[PDB]
């Protein structure tokens, strides 16, 4: 017979094999289509998140009912050290798509990423790359032909970058790497752009600006070998039942006498490499400079760091870049920020959108206060003398 009452299918089928991913860092599938009349700038960025905060806004939605009248909105803030680029690698066209025929490092490679290639540091005599620094000791007699072997060849060239852990309170002491597509143009100075940016950093406003639609690519947090009710979402069978209470009931018919790939049973939940698209940016704020949590008319010199710091991460005095909603992944991860794929139409981008009140309230409690100088003169003088 049939199934007597039709219903949708629990759980998406095009996300399995729902398996724990490669590393903490997630790879990026794609990049925007290059157009070679554009200035050379890198198209995706590497950073860490800290934890989300709260924002009120001033809606420019003509037609709706909260036009020019208040809302709250959930922003998250991902922060970033000034990341720094240490070499390009060119991919040539081939019937097998892309293919690495180059690699070119800096001369002074930093100790934070001579950390990275080793996996047992202190016992080593640290001797990575010390025969590769011999090539730069001449005028360029092993690289100028090598960069000529990436000017002439390698129709797509992507450059690799590495973080600054030494300016970040994440106690890892071991940086990371990636690649980033270069979507400017003029391929043989798209090479020579990176030839300049050996041994120099790059900022966060170097890749993004305000009021634009970023695209998030990251990894998910994980919860272990989870069952079947949380995993897919199927129904709890009734209280009366025996051999369990929250299993899946029947798996298949008699024929086919082999259980499907389409049936919902237990296993791994979380720590997949998910994604989430079309997130809105608000404020690519500089960290060192004046009053990064001072909006347009609060006029109160403060930080974006909440009172007592963010929980499990500490304070941000580095660069930070805040994102509407919820990027996939919990605090202290390597979340990356791809740019768009298409210039929007739905009047959700293509506006300006303001900002009215960032917070500082203690997110390690049900906090009340906005400045440690504000609860001082509100309560008075405590038994602690002033």
């Amino acid at each position: 017979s049939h199934r007597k009452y039709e219903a949708p299918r629990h759980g998406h089928l095009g996300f399995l094999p729902r398996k724990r991913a490669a590393s903490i860092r997630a790879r990026v599938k794609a990049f925007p289509k290059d157009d070679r009349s554009k200035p050379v700038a890198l198209t995706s960025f590497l950073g860490y998140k800290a934890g989300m905060t709260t924002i009120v806004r001033d809606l420019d939605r003509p037609g709706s009912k909260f036009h020019k009248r208040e809302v709250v909105e959930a922003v998250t803030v991902v922060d970033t050290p000034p990341v720094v680029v240490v070499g390009v690698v060119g991919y040539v066209e081939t019937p097998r798509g892309l293919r690495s025929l180059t690699t070119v490092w800096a001369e002074h490679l930093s100790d934070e990423v001579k950390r990275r290639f080793y996996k047992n540091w202190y016992k080593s005599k640290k001797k990575a790359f010390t025969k590769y620094s011999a090539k730069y000791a001449q005028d360029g007699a092993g690289i100028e032909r090598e960069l000529a072997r990436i000017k002439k060849y390698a129709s797509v060239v992507r450059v690799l970058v590495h973080t600054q852990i030494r300016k970040t309170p994440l106690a890892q002491k071991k940086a990371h790497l990636a690649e980033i597509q270069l979507n400017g143009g003029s391929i043989s100075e798209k090479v020579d752009w990176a030839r300049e940016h050996f041994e120099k950093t790059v900022a966060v406003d170097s890749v993004f600006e305000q009021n634009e639609m970023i695209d998030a690519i990251a990894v998910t947090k994980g919860h272990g070998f989870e069952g079947v009710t949380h995993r897919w979402g199927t129904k709890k069978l009734p209280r009366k039942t025996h051999r369990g209470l929250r299993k899946v009931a029947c798996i298949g018919a008699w024929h086919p006498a082999h259980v499907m790939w389409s049936v919902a049973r237990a296993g791994q939940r979380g720590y997949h490499s998910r994604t989430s698209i079309n997130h809105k940016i608000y404020r690519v704020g500089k960290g060192d400079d004046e009053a990064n949590g001072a909006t347009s008319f609060d006029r109160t010199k403060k930080t974006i760091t909440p009172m007592g710091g963010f929980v499990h991460y500490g304070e941000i005095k580095n660069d930070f870049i805040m994102v509407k909603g919820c990027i996939p992944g919990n605090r202290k991860r390597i979340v990356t920020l791809r740019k768009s794929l298409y210039t929007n139409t739905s009047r959700k981008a293509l506006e300006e959108v303001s900002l009215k009140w960032i917070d500082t309230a203690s997110k390690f409690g049900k906090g009340r206060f906005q400045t440690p100088a504000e609860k001082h003169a509100f309560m008075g003088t405590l038994k602690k003398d002033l």
């Binding site: 709260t54 208040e70 609060d298 009140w357 917070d359 309230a361 049900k366």
Partner: protein, 64 residues
């Protein structure tokens, strides 16, 4: 700004924090946290609660 000073302990209400309890007799009761509201379900008068500013003002502690 959109500040509000609530109706159980004189605490602070910011957009993005707090609750609101109307009554069938049309009386709003803005609170901040559920400590200041679960006492109110139990009917705790704020003038005999040792941390409220309604009680704090009434015994000469920090006014002159």
């Amino acid at each position: 700004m959109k500040v509000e000073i609530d109706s159980f302990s004189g605490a602070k209400i910011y957009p993005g924090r707090g609750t609101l309890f109307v009554r069938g007799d049309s009386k709003i009761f803005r609170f901040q946290n559920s400590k200041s509201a679960s006492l109110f379900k139990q009917r705790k008068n704020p003038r005999r609660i040792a941390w409220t500013v309604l009680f704090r003002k009434h015994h000469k502690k920090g006014i002159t």
